[PDB]
Amino acid sequence: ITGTSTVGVGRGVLGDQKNINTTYSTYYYLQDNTRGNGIFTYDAKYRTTLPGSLWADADNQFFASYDAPAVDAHYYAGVTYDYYKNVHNRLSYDGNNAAIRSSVHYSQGYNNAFWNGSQMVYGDGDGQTFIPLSGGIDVVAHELTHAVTDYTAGLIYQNESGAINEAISDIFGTLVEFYANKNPDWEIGEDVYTPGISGDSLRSMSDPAKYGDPDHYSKRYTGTQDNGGVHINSGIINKAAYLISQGGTHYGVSVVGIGRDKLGKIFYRALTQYLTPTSNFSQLRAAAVQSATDLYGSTSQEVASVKQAFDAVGVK
Numbered sequence: 207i208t209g210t211s212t213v214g215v216g217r218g219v220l221g222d223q224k225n226i227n228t229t230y231s232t233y234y235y236l237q238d239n240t241r242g243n244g245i246f247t248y249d250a251k252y253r254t255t256l257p258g259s260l261w262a263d264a265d266n267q268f269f270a271s272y273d274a275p276a277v278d279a280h281y282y283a284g285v286t287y288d289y290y291k292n293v294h295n296r297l298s299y300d301g302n303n304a305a306i307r308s309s310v311h312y313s314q315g316y317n318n319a320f321w322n323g324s325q326m327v328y329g330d331g332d333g334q335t336f337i338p339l340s341g342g343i344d345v346v347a348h349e350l351t352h353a354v355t356d357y358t359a360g361l362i363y364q365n366e367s368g369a370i371n372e373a374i375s376d377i378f379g380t381l382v383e384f385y386a387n388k389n390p391d392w393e394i395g396e397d398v399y400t401p402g403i404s405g406d407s408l409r410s411m412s413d414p415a416k417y418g419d420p421d422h423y424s425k426r427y428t429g430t431q432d433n434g435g436v437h438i439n440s441g442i443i444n445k446a447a448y449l450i451s452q453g454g455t456h457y458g459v460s461v462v463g464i465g466r467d468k469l470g471k472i473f474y475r476a477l478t479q480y481l482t483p484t485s486n487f488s489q490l491r492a493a494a495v496q497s498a499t500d501l502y503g504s505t506s507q508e509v510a511s512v513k514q515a516f517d518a519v520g521v522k
């Protein structure tokens with residue numbers, strides 16, 4: 207909408223207060239004009255018709271329980287935009303400052319979030335499996351990263367390419383969580399998953415097997431559920447990424463860590479310059495090796511560590 211940029215204040219899903227960029231024109235809308243061509247957050251009103259209505263508020267204060275998922279979807283989309291711009295010199299998901307749209311209060315008791323090809327969509331959860339999923343910065347960044355993937359490598363959402371697609375979203379979701387630097391970890395979704403159970407999460411990158419997912423190619427799933435295991439076999443790539451960053455010895459193979467920043471540079475370059483819609487795990491290894499070679503040199507530690515990490519998870 208046309209209006210003037212304003213600054214509201216509210217509380218997110220976890221009860222934390224934060225400022226949000228809004229737009230005033232009769233109402234205060236969740237429209238952040240400070241980033242690209244805007245970040246826009248919508249109310250889906252417990253229905254499934256998208257996007258719903260641009261979020262309107264009478265007083266620029268967003269402290270109601272109903273407001274909390276919107277506050278966080280809006281704010282964490284901003285953090286994610288900032289990460290891609292400041293760290294990777296990428297302007298929004300398309301690289302040309304496309305408007306970023308999210309809808310919250312999608313459906314009833316909806317235990318998921320997704321990119322629908324055009325926007326992000328967040329359920330509220332059923333209150334037992336999840337609380338509203340936009341409360342997780344890693345989840346928000348995971349979802350927006352699907353848009354980045356779709357505009358770049360275009361990894362098909364099934365089988366190995368789809369597991370790479372998922373892992374890219376978990377990797378950058380985690381790197382955004384570290385960028386914001388509030389309780390960062392290598393787990394996915396811990397802030398919104400199972401409010402009655404402490405210390406768990408949806409997936410672990412450091413130890414995928416803790417939540418049932420493979421950590422070696424010899425344990426990959428090859429059935430048909432979950433689009434051929436895209437959220438399952440992502441554990442193999444997540445583990446490789448974790449080892450590149452943090453190091454470790456895994457199934458007897460030692461990896462010298464190179465840190466999160468270099469992990470992000472290598473995988474961002476692989477995603478945007480080498481991966482294709484049909485890339486498989488072996489092709490991802492080759493893309494990561496080439497990316498690290500471009501950035502750091504063929505004789506570098508970074509190249510050697512990428513190779514060690516993929517060796518450790520059984521990907522040649």
Ligand SMILES: CC(C)C[C@H](NC(=O)CNP(=O)(O)CNC(=O)OCc1ccccc1)C(=O)O
Binds near residue numbers: 322363408437
């Ligand atoms: C319990 C769940 C939270 C776990 C998992 N989801 C995630 O980890 C995050 N959402 P996501 O990975 O973005 C969904 N992915 C998803 O819904 O993919 C289908 C689609 C394709 C094209 C258009 C619209 C939807 C899942 O879906 O099993």
Ligand SMILES: [Ca+2]
Binds near residue numbers: 264
């Ligand atoms: Ca209000």
Ligand SMILES: [Ca+2]
Binds near residue numbers: 388
């Ligand atoms: Ca965390």
Ligand SMILES: [Ca+2]
Binds near residue numbers: 383393396
């Ligand atoms: Ca996390």
Ligand SMILES: [Ca+2]
Binds near residue numbers: 404405
């Ligand atoms: Ca929990």
Ligand SMILES: [Kr]
Binds near residue numbers: 299
């Ligand atoms: Kr982005």
Ligand SMILES: [Kr]
Binds near residue numbers: 344345348395
């Ligand atoms: Kr997620």
Ligand SMILES: [Zn+2]
Binds near residue numbers: 348352372375
């Ligand atoms: Zn995903």
